[PDB]
């Protein structure tokens, strides 16, 4: 597993990383994490749980990576991590480690696979999900268009039928059976909608992943 750490990147090994996990009741993973400030933050809320970032591209959470790795009360997390990597090929080291898994606003492919969905990404983020732990989405259709002109298909709705038809079979076929589908609204004025929801509409998705017994 690659580590980020400021503008270093560092190799990891599952023993590694169990040696940080200790101590620890709770993971939490951050998926397509940016920045990671989210991380970053549920890190000081949450001093029970390990939190991961993840992001294919290291520079993006040089920053907070750097000051999360500082003492505490400069600003260090230590429950905090970030990891360099994509949902295309998401590092073993982090299979069913996960209490929750988030995606927050992820751009348009990995929008596409959680709402169409797509099989192999549902079948890669199950795998990091341990049994009884949750996959929570927050979507949103003016993110970044990451997609290939071609592939701009027009994304459908998350309407009942959708849900019925689509997306709890799929995500049954990959290890999930979803909970929650919401309108992240559904009165304040103009603006308080677009700070809580970012932009307009938001839908939340929450889905439990599910094993033998």
């Not at 609204?185 to 094993?211: F, K, N, V, Y």
């Amino acid at each position: 597993m690659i580590v980020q750490l400021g503008k270093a990147s560092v190799t990891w090994t599952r023993a590694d990383l169990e040696a940080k996990l200790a101590g620890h009741a709770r993971v939490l993973i951050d998926v397509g994490t940016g920045d990671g400030r989210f991380v970053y933050r549920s890190a000081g809320a949450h001093p029970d749980t390990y939190c991961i970032g993840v992001d294919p591209a290291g520079e993006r959470m040089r920053e907070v990576s750097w000051r999360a790795s500082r003492k505490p009360a400069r600003g260090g997390r230590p429950n905090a991590l970030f990891v360099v990597a994509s949902v295309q090929a998401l590092p073993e080291e982090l299979a069913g480690l996960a209490h929750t898994l988030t995606l927050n606003f992820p751009w348009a492919s990995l929008l596409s696979a959680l709402v169409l969905p797509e099989a192999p990404v549902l079948e890669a983020l199950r795998r990091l999900v341990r049994p009884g732990g949750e996959l929570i989405a927050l979507l949103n259709q003016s993110v970044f268009d990451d997609r290939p002109y071609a592939a701009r298909l027009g994304l459908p709705e998350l309407s009942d039928a959708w849900l019925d038809d689509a997306l709890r079979p799929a995500y049954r076929a990959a290890g999930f059976e979803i909970r929650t589908s919401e309108i992240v609204d559904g009165q304040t004025s103009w603006g308080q909608h677009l700070t809580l929801a970012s932009g307009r509409r938001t839908r939340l998705l929450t889905a439990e992943a599910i094993g033998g017994s």
